[PDB]
């Protein structure tokens, strides 16, 4: 409020209490409660100005209460009581409540006391959506930090995550992101990747465009890669790394853009081959930055050219090179992702063979693929289901025909085209004979 009766008169009276500040201090020792009463008695006003000056005294006392690793119990009831009475307004206290919090971080008190006093603050403010909301969150992440380290991580994870669904208040946009990224983090360790997806679609790519959140964007994208790796979505890992790449800062600096680009190659080759794969792999072929690299240049350029190549050797070839690097390939866990590269090689070979070979014997196709009869046939089946190729197989070991099923329509429509093209040619020839008369 703005009540004019306790401006100066009361200010002057608190200064008179400042002079009595040693008398209160000496009282505390004889009885903590008498020193306390006096300062509680001073505060009843609802004049904001004098509220902050009086509460400042009460706050100095709480320094002593918190310092003492036993008095601090009393502090729990008092904050609770100050809430309980009426308060003095929705503006007033709620600044002071923060100086309550400020002190806790720096005391470096016994874990036990800290914990109790902290659960009592979130208790006091729980429901409330005035200023306090922001602060509730500031302290809740701290209660989490303690339980995080313990074996109580599961309990920690569920509380943290629960809170932030609703906190969307006065809070600056930067801080919202921060909390959210933290939430994703505990959910990696818990191992429900499905949970983490729900959380992630909260933050928006519109936000990140603002340069204020630059550093935030890198951690955010870094995390998104992780989510996708667990569920073996290889293309989806590629799309997210490509967004980082385009962050200008990293881009221009040599040493920092280097690893990023390497990663992208690995995952782009592992993606299910398809229309997305294709348009994306000629962007990497075009990429100038790629040709300065030579270890990765030599890998992409192989798979783009249609000249087939047998697995046993390509394995060998890039093993002492790329298995060295991390993500996708790398150590021991990483080898159970490396494996997939095999599969990639043969569905590229088959793919080339459908185009060039219209007819091929089945025994020969096995020889080329370097696989026994039973695996070869499994794989052909898998490709037609996926629609990559058209196939007709014969098991008594006759022929496998990739040729287009030759329909009525195809013969006629192609013939239709041809004829217009002819007519078009004759005309063109005609313009140019005119030209040659002038020349000659």
């Amino acid at each position: 409020m703005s009540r004019d009766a306790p401006i100066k008169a009361d200010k002057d009276y608190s200064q008179i209490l400042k002079e009595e500040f040693p008398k209160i201090d000496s009282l505390a020792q004889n009885d903590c409660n008498s020193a306390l009463d006096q300062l509680l008695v001073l505060e009843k006003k609802t004049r904001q100005a004098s509220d902050l000056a009086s509460s400042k005294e009460v706050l100095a006392k709480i320094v002593d209460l918190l310092a003492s690793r036993n008095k601090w119990d009393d502090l729990n009831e008092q904050l609770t009581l100050l809430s309980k009475k009426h308060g003095q307004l929705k503006l007033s206290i709620q600044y002071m409540i923060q100086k309550v919090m400020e002190y806790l971080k720096s005391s470096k008190s016994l874990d036990l006391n800290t914990r109790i006093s902290v659960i009592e603050t979130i208790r006091v403010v729980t429901e409330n959506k005035i200023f306090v909301e922001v602060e509730r969150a500031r302290v809740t992440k701290d209660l989490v930090e303690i339980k995080k380290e313990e074996g109580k991580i599961d309990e920690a994870a569920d509380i943290l995550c629960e809170l932030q669904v609703e906190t969307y208040g006065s809070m600056e946009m930067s801080e919202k992101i921060q909390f959210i990224l933290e939430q994703m983090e505990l959910s990696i360790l818990k191992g429900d990747y499905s949970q983490a997806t729900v959380l992630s679609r909260k933050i928006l790519k519109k936000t990140f465009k603002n340069p204020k959140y630059e550093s935030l964007k890198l951690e955010y994208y870094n995390l998104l890669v992780k989510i996708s790796l667990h569920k073996r979505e290889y293309l989806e890992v590629a799309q997210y790394l490509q967004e980082i790449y385009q962050t200008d800062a990293i881009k221009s600096d040599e040493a920092k853009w280097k690893p990023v680009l390497s990663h992208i190659v690995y995952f782009l080759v592992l993606s299910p081959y398809g229309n997305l794969q294709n348009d994306l792999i000629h962007k990497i072929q075009n990429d100038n930055n790629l040709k300065k690299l030579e270890s990765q240049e030599s890998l992409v350029k192989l798979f783009t050219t249609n000249e087939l190549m047998r697995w046993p050797i390509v394995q060998k070839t890039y093993e002492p090179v790329l298995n060295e690097d991390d993500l996708a390939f790398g150590g021991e866990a990483n080898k159970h992702h490396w494996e997939d590269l095999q599969k990639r090689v043969i569905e590229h070979n088959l793919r080339v063979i459908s185009e060039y070979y219209s007819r091929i014997t089945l025994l020969r196709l096995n020889e080329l693929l370097d696989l026994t009869e039973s695996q070869t046939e499994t794989y052909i089946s898998d490709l037609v289901n996926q629609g990559i190729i058209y196939a007709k197989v014969n098991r008594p070991a006759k022929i496998v025909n990739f040729e287009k099923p030759k329909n009525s329509s195809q013969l006629l429509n192609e013939w239709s085209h041809n004829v217009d093209e002819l007519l078009e040619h004759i005309e063109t020839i005609g313009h140019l004979i005119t030209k040659e008369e002038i020349m000659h």
């Binding site: 429900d192 499905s194 949970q195 052909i380 089946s381 037609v384 196939a391 007709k392 197989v393 014969n394 098991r395 008594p396 006759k398």
Partner: protein, 163 residues
């Protein structure tokens, strides 16, 4: 009354009506004070999932199945059975269905409704496996079919001729 109507419309070999009935009874049990109804929330769930299997629309089995309910508050022997059998149909594989019931055999006995509909399941799935095998081939030996499906030469000839 709902659950009982569910059991009956299922036997009349209509599975649209079957789902709707087994929804109402699930919602009732779920929210009621359990004193014995936990058991009957359990019975309902197994039969609800049944409707989707026969309907051959198993994308919705794994959709319903989630952490919210089937994992936290209903984790039972029937969940492990039902989920394997759903997955087997999605595969369109006879081999997986057979393996699923050998080791979940006492769950299949224990539900008289499930058991009945599982002979039928055998038969419509028998189809699913064969079709997949001969789809890329032309002029495929019958010996090759016979091994994979894991049923005798002559038995197969009679089925194919029927198909």
């Amino acid at each position: 009354l709902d659950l009982m109507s569910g059991i009956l419309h299922c036997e009349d070999k209509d599975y649209k009506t079957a789902f709707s009935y087994f929804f109402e009874s699930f919602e009732s049990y779920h929210n009621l004070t359990t004193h014995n109804s936990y058991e009957k929330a359990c019975q309902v769930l197994k039969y609800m999932l049944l409707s989707k299997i026969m309907l051959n629309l198993i994308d919705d089995v794994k959709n319903i199945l989630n952490a919210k309910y089937t994992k936290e508050t209903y984790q039972s022997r029937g969940i492990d059975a039902m989920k394997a059998v759903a997955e087997a149909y999605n595969n369109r594989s006879l081999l997986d269905f057979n393996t699923a019931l050998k080791q979940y055999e006492k769950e299949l006995m224990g539900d008289e409704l499930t058991r009945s509909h599982f002979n039928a399941l055998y038969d419509t799935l028998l189809e699913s496996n064969l079709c997949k095998i001969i789809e890329p081939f032309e002029c495929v030996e019958i010996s090759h079919i016979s091994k994979i499906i894991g049923l005798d030469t002559q038995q197969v000839e009679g089925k194919l001729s029927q198909m």
